[PDB]
């Protein structure tokens, strides 16, 4: 069977939506109901990873920009980055480790743990208009819990 994907949007537990901050960055802010179309639409693929009832291995891409979210060690820091890919080759079932996130549902909210960096999560700051980043905890002050809205397809 070939790789399957669904279109969706993310909203953190504090109701912040995700938008393009630049060509290779995402930021999080509260959008008015009329500005919702500025939010990024992700192509979420169900990829190869650890067989778990809790963790669902996924890859998150931005189809129109040929980008995938990826986790890389930048100098001494595990870092969330947007990486360009060849759309003729991606998505695929066997996504390289840097592209894999373990999607975990907890109290009806979603967390996205980096497979490359266990215990590191897709995170937002409590402050407005700050970049989306990789955070070293699902706890503390930063936000790691989201809701997903699927887009008609």
């Amino acid at each position: 069977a070939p790789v399957r994907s669904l279109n969706c949007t993310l909203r953190d537990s504090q109701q912040k939506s995700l938008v393009m901050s630049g060509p290779y960055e995402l930021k999080a802010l509260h959008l008015q109901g009329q500005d919702m179309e500025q939010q990024v639409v992700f192509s979420m693929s169900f990829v190869q990873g650890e067989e778990s009832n809790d963790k669902i291995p996924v890859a998150l891409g931005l189809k129109e920009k040929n980008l995938y979210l990826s986790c890389v060690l930048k100098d001494d820091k595990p870092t969330l980055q947007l990486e360009s890919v060849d759309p003729k080759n991606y998505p695929k079932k066997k996504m390289e480790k840097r592209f894999v996130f373990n999607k975990i549902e907890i109290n009806n909210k979603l967390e996205f743990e980096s497979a490359q960096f266990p215990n590191w999560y897709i995170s937002t700051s409590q402050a407005e208009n700050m970049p989306v980043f990789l955070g070293g905890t699902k706890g503390g002050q930063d936000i790691t819990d989201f809701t997903m809205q699927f887009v008609s397809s």
């Binding site: 070939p2 790789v3 399957r4 994907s5 669904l6 279109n7 192509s43 891409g61 189809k63 040929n66 759309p87 003729k88 080759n89 991606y90 998505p91 695929k92 008609s152 397809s153």
Partner: peptide, 14 residues
């Protein structure tokens, strides 16, 4: 391509 249930199968450029 989009199947009858709304899943996109294969790469972005099939």
């Amino acid at each position: 391509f989009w199947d009858s249930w709304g899943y996109w199968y294969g790469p972005w450029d099939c």
